[PDB]
Design an enzyme around this catalytic site. Structure first.
Site, PDB file in Angstrom:
ATOM      1  CB  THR A  17      -0.940   0.058   1.211  1.00  0.00           C
ATOM      2  OG1 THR A  17      -0.134  -0.153   2.382  1.00  0.00           O
ATOM      3  CG2 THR A  17      -2.045  -1.010   1.127  1.00  0.00           C
ATOM      4  N   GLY A  99      18.886 -10.317   4.157  1.00  0.00           N
ATOM      5  CA  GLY A  99      18.130 -10.685   2.961  1.00  0.00           C
ATOM      6  C   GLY A  99      16.984 -11.611   3.282  1.00  0.00           C
ATOM      7  N   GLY A 101      13.998 -10.453   4.458  1.00  0.00           N
ATOM      8  CA  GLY A 101      12.737  -9.714   4.402  1.00  0.00           C
ATOM      9  C   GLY A 101      12.398  -8.976   5.682  1.00  0.00           C
ATOM     10  CG  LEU A 102      13.029 -10.250   9.071  1.00  0.00           C
ATOM     11  CD1 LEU A 102      13.541 -10.943  10.311  1.00  0.00           C
ATOM     12  CD2 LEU A 102      11.471 -10.172   9.093  1.00  0.00           C
ATOM     13  CB  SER A 103      13.872  -3.727   6.583  1.00  0.00           C
ATOM     14  OG  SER A 103      14.321  -2.572   5.891  1.00  0.00           O
ATOM     15  CB  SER A 104      19.331  -6.584   6.627  1.00  0.00           C
ATOM     16  OG  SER A 104      19.467  -6.891   5.265  1.00  0.00           O
ATOM     17  CD  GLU A 137      16.503   0.387   0.257  1.00  0.00           C
ATOM     18  OE1 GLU A 137      16.332   0.681   1.480  1.00  0.00           O
ATOM     19  OE2 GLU A 137      16.451  -0.783  -0.171  1.00  0.00           O
ATOM     20  CG  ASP A 149      11.189  -1.552   4.284  1.00  0.00           C
ATOM     21  OD1 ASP A 149      10.099  -2.026   4.610  1.00  0.00           O
ATOM     22  OD2 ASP A 149      11.803  -1.953   3.264  1.00  0.00           O
ATOM     23  CE1 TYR A 198       7.769  -3.363  -3.069  1.00  0.00           C
ATOM     24  CE2 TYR A 198       8.790  -1.839  -4.638  1.00  0.00           C
ATOM     25  CZ  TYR A 198       8.145  -2.085  -3.431  1.00  0.00           C
ATOM     26  OH  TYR A 198       7.880  -1.055  -2.567  1.00  0.00           O
TER      27      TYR A 198
HETATM   28  O1  LIG Z   1       4.447  -3.596   1.645  1.00  0.00           O
HETATM   29  C1  LIG Z   1       5.400  -3.989   0.661  1.00  0.00           C
HETATM   30  C2  LIG Z   1       6.793  -3.513   1.083  1.00  0.00           C
HETATM   31  O2  LIG Z   1       7.774  -4.110   0.234  1.00  0.00           O
HETATM   32  C3  LIG Z   1       9.127  -3.791   0.572  1.00  0.00           C
HETATM   33  O3  LIG Z   1       9.470  -4.302   1.855  1.00  0.00           O
HETATM   34  C4  LIG Z   1       9.357  -2.272   0.483  1.00  0.00           C
HETATM   35  O4  LIG Z   1      10.672  -1.918   0.884  1.00  0.00           O
HETATM   36  C5  LIG Z   1       8.314  -1.526   1.322  1.00  0.00           C
HETATM   37  O5  LIG Z   1       8.462  -0.113   1.159  1.00  0.00           O
HETATM   38  C6  LIG Z   1       6.880  -1.985   0.970  1.00  0.00           C
HETATM   39  O6  LIG Z   1       6.474  -1.548  -0.320  1.00  0.00           O
END
Ligand SMILES: OC[C@H]1O[C@H](O)[C@H](O)[C@@H](O)[C@H]1O
Length: 350
Positions: A17, A99, A101-104, A137, A149, A198
Site C-alpha cells: 500500500t 536478505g 525480508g526483515l529490512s536489513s 536507497e 521500512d 515488485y
Molecule cells: O508492503 C510492501 C513492502 O515491500 C518492501 O518491503 C518495500 O521496501 C516496502 O516499502 C513496501 O512496499
C-alpha cells in the site's frame, strides 16, 4: 567510539500500500544491526556478516555493486542535502538476518546515518532520518521502495506498532498485546530474486492512480475500479481492500481484540496470494500450518516472493509452534529456513 543499534522491522498489516500512499502498520523488532565506530579520514568498515573490510575515500562515492554501496548511499545523500561529514572507521555486526525480508537494508542504512549523526553532531530530526535513508536507497542504491521500512526502523517504540498514513506522514502508536508473540518464519527463499516483480506491481499501481486521477489509494473505492484495465483492476482491488483492513486492525488492536486482528491478517494473506499474486508455496505452507497449530492469524510480511512470514501466537506456544512447523518444512523444502520470536521494539539509537 560510539555504538548504535538499529532494528529491523516487520509489517503487521498494510502490504503493497505504501507506493500508492495508503496505510501501513509496521513495528521495529528486537533483531539489530550494530555499528561501533569512530571518526576517520576515510570510510573503513568491517562487516561480520561478510567477514570482510571494505573502504572508500570520501572522494569516492562511485557505485561498486557490493554491500559498501549502502554506506556510500548515505554519504551521497548527506552531500546532496548539504551536510559536511567526515569519514568513519568501525565494525558492523548484530543478529538481524540478511536478505530475509526483515529490512536489513533499512536497518543498515539508518544505522550508518545515525552513526554519522552522532559522531558529527548533525542533530537530524527523526523524519529527516527516514527521508534521507529512503532517498539513498531509491536514488543511489537504486532499489524502488516506499517509506514503510525506513519509518519503522526510526520511529519504532517498544511494545507498540505504528499506524502510518504514508500520504500525509501522520502516525499513531498503538499498543501490541501482552503475551502475544510475533513468530517470524524465514522461508530461506531470498526475495531479491523477484525484484522485477515488485517494480512491476509498483509501476501498474502508479499508472492506475493516474488513470483514476487520484493521488492516493485512500481516495479510491472498489466501485471506481471498473474504470481500470482488467490487470490493473485485479491488483488495485487488493490495494483498496488492504487499506480498509489496516483501519480494521487499528480498531481491533485498540480494543485488545487479538482474535479479530488475527482473522484480518489471514484474510489479507490469501488476498495477497490469490489476487496480488505475490506469495509462494513456501509462504502459504507456513501460513496454513501456523493456523492449524493455533495461531490467531498469519501472513507473509514485506514484498513477498519468498522472505519471511509472521504468525500471531500465544507467547507460551511460540517456540513449540515454530519448532513443529520448521521440522515439517525442512522435510518438504530444500532451503535453510529459520524461525525467530520477536517483539515490538524501539527505533534506532545509542
Ligand atoms: O508492503 C510492501 C513492502 O515491500 C518492501 O518491503 C518495500 O521496501 C516496502 O516499502 C513496501 O512496499
Amino acid at each position: 567510539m560510539i555504538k548504535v543499534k538499529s532494528p529491523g522491522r516487520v509489517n503487521l498489516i498494510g502490504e503493497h500500500t505504501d507506493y500508492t500512499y495508503g496505510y501501513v502498520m509496521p513495528m521495529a523488532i528486537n533483531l539489530y544491526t550494530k555499528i561501533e565506530a569512530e571518526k576517520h579520514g576515510e570510510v573503513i568498515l568491517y562487516s561480520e556478516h561478510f567477514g570482510e573490510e571494505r573502504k572508500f575515500s570520501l572522494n569516492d562515492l562511485r557505485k561498486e555493486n557490493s554491500w559498501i554501496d549502502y554506506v556510500k548511499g548515505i554519504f551521497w545523500v548527506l552531500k546532496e542535502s548539504d551536510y559536511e561529514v567526515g569519514g568513519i572507521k568501525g565494525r558492523v555486526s548484530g543478529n538481524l538476518p540478511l536478505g530475509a525480508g526483515l529490512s536489513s537494508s533499512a536497518s543498515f542504512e539508518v544505522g550508518i546515518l545515525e552513526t554519522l549523526d552522532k559522531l558529527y553532531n548533525l542533530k537530524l530530526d527523526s523524519l529527516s532520518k527516514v527521508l534521507l535513508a529512503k532517498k539513498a536507497e531509491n536514488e543511489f542504491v537504486g532499489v524502488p521502495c516506499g517509506i514503510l521500512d525506513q519509518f519503522a526502523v526510526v520511529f519504532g517504540r517498544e511494545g507498540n506498532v505504528i499506524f502510518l498514513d504514508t500520504h500525509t506522514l501522520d502516525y499513531e502508536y498503538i499498543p501490541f498485546p501482552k503475551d502475544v508473540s510475533i513468530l517470524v518464519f524465514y522461508t530461506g527463499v531470498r526475495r531479491e530474486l523477484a525484484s522485477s516483480e515488485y517494480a512491476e506491481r509498483k509501476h501498474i499501481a502508479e499508472e492506475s492512480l493516474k488513470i483514476l486521477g487520484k493521488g492516493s489509494s485512500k481516495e479510491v473505492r472498489e466501485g471506481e475500479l471498473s474504470k481500470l484495465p482488467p490487470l490493473h483492476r485485479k491488483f488495485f482491488g487488493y490495494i483498496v481492500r488492504e487499506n480498509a483492513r489496516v483501519l480494521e486492525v487499528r480498531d481491533a488492536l485498540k480494543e485488545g481484540n487479538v482474535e479479530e486482528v488475527g482473522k484480518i491478517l489471514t484474510t489479507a494473506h490469501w488476498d495477497l496470494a490469490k489476487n496480488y499474486e505475490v506469495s509462494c508455496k513456501e509462504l502459504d505452507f507456513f501460513v496454513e500450518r501456523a493456523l492449524k497449530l493455533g495461531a490467531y492469524g498469519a501472513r507473509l510480511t514485506g514484498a513477498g516472493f519468498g522472505g519471511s512470514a509472521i504468525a500471531l501466537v500465544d507467547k507460551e506456544d511460540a517456540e513449540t509452534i515454530g519448532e513443529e512447523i520448521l521440522r515439517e518444512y525442512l522435510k518438504r523444502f530444500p532451503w535453510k529456513a529459520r524461525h525467530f520470536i520477536v517483539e515490538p521494539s524501539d527505533g534506532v539509537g545509542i
